[PDB]
RNA sequence: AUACAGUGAAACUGCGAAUCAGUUAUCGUUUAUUUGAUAGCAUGGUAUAACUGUGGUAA
RNA sequence: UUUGAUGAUUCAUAAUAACUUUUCGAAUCGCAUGGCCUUGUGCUGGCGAUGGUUCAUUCAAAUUUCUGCCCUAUCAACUUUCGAUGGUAGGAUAGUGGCCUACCAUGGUUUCAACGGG
């Protein structure tokens, strides 16, 4: 069907110049007496616009018989540029294509007009931006590429001059103008053989301090041949680009050559990049190479890549290079040589963190050696708690240097913790989890705030006397890690007598209804552990109804039925079971994250034991939303001021930003402790909803 | 006769065939939408509070009922304690998620700071090898465009008035000129 | 294009479905439509379609 | 010396008073999304798609003034039967208006070819 009505920006998106790729028999292949006269009279016939008519009435004495043109060169050129500087939109195609033709007949005598012609052209491209016509842009950029096609013989040495003339198009900060003009200039780059292109690349790199994306588009359009085929001069254009690179250019030019290599690698599929890789390897044999190597290992002879990387490492960036080589490598011998280089590669915590975020595979040898070589980075790396590589974490955590473990045991023996030595003991016990007597002693000394209590409970879960001391501390009492410690003690008689001696579990069975569902799940898993170590049908129904909490529409349609059945059982059927059922009902009605479950709770609150804890819990819920709890623990300040290897790409910028955030997480100890304090469980929330 | 019974919370529905017509004899001359108890009509189903739907007779046409309604339908208004086989246990999901912005805000309890855009329902449809995830829509959502159009309506009203009551004055200038003339 | 963004069946909504003859007035009526003028809460709730299912029914 | 006219007005229009089973004064959409700099995440801003108050226009309808057509005096009386014809009010009317109601009057048509019939 016809009639689609693409918008103006839509047509600009469809636009690409490529006039030598546009193949018709236009006028110029059929040449009369002049080369200008045929396109003159043809446009005189096909187009009517009043200033084009009076222009034709002005120049008709001198258009015909090309001696007339070569005599009357300047005067009718001034007539041309005056009418283009008049510029109604309907006269633009004839006058502009005639000015395009006005150089092809002449050749060298147009170079006394060339600069002023391009000046009128760029003024009219600004007028075209305020005109909003994709046809006008198409004609103007088409005639510009025509001028460059007809004058590429004489525009060899003056490349720097003409790009300095056309630099209001490249750095215009309106990206489709530069995306247009970069095609024409890239055709000129494809024209110019070697040395003038080298000087042009030098001046273009030097003038770089929105010109960066324009230079990227010019390089990509110079390499841009047909579909899945590279340019014929691409192997030499990469040579001129690498010669202008390698410490001959500014800082952003390295990322510019990187992004040009990225777009060229995305364009040319596989076989078109044999000679490009050969020329780039020949330019890389001499020895900035780091951003280039990471860029060429982005897009996926890896042994030759490993050999060149080993030479350039014999002589962060090396961490990102090794991470990408690990994510896309194919040789276990090269991986072992990379472990040999990882012996000399610093920041191995951040390197292993980004590598484990990338993949999870064989050759995990250097982790134990880095642990034996041995602070805050090891603290954060062990603080990566529940990963997919936890199966290797729990098996390789023993391989650390136990001298550091016994040294932390000497710091965990005595603890004079006022405000920050509790945090220092938290940082110690985090590593000491991967390392019972000192645990119970330090826990007694510590119980003699919330973050230090949660960290002590983590060492408690990592650790019947200890169970009695933990029950005494729970009678003396964040709560998520505390219930983790309690469940780890209860699952990891004498214990029956020790639990029957102390009366407990009523406080936890009452305060299981918290505003955090993970805290509710931890309390529900802890209370069943206590009732197991010292009824169970209704408790397991309440645990299973809170188990299927992934409230997708199938499971959320299922959960109202499951909660209604368990509530019918526990309402048609002890004081502790009534407290646990009331706490589960209060937690379900105070979740306020799914209105499916809050309909089942409003159904289940209709047949309860009258005013047992119902109206008391309702008054507690109404009073919970008059003020809010706050003020978690603080820390000091830290500063990375680092982690840059890229400027602007599509996905390479995202991968580099991910490695930069990884390095800023593996930054200094104050930021590491701030990230550790950020790594917490849930808390009280949902104000105004409860 | 045949009794289509539908559990509403799951929403499931299955049919039964009811012989022993003196169970059906209490349905008779009773108006549509009146209460029916579980054990009080039948044998096995206990405590199932119902209400009759009415509907189609013999050969399918529709207050006071006779024995022509072969297809009698019920929804389980209140479940008793009978463990049904495809109604109460096997749950079918509610199909279409909420579409409107404040409808989603009611469905997940959002406040006036959320600007939801992630509390949308999701779905992944499976070709078998290449998945297609989809977020449908948040309609009646406050956009940057909607208050732009509200601002444009304000600007158009104030511009029309601030041209009209001034063109009044430039007419009154010519009227004052003719009054000084005459 | 992790709200949406391409095409888009279905469905809702919107729109449209004795001839009398010449012959004046409508300061006696309405005037759908076109055309031209024209008016100083970051935005809430229903009640449902298509669809998923349970059937009857020779239909 | 204050106001827009037609041949012509209780015309067009303006002011007060309240009645409104309370009408409207945009909870709408597409393309771009540019600017001001106190960079808020602010305030602004373009083109046009629909809607909507009133008036005019345009297109219409429904009535209305004046003439006409088939043969006839083996058709001279026809209409106030259960409206015939007026005037006054009311209702109906989208309205002028027996389109109807009651009340007041007893009219009106016709040898001119009426009235009736072919």
Structure explained in plain terms:
The structure is cut from a larger assembly and holds chains A (690 residues) and B (182 residues). Chain A is an all-alpha fold. In chain A, 66% of the residues lie in helices and 0% in strands. In chain A, helix 26 runs parallel beside helix 28 and helix 30 packs parallel to helix 33. The longest helix of chain A has 20 residues. Chain B is α+β, with helices and mostly antiparallel strands. In chain B, the strands form three sheets. A three-stranded mixed sheet of chain B has the order 2-1-5, with no helix packed on it. In chain B, strands 3-4 form a two-stranded antiparallel ribbon. In chain B, a hairpin with a 4-residue loop joins strand 6 and strand 7. Chain B is elongated and about 105 Å long. At the A-B interface, helix 35 of A face helix 2 of B. Chain B binds two RNA strands through strand 1, strand 2, helix 2 and helix 3. Chain B: This is Small ribosomal subunit protein eS6A. Chain B: One of its GO terms (cellular component) is cytosolic small ribosomal subunit. Chain B: It comes from Saccharomyces cerevisiae (strain ATCC 204508 / S288c).
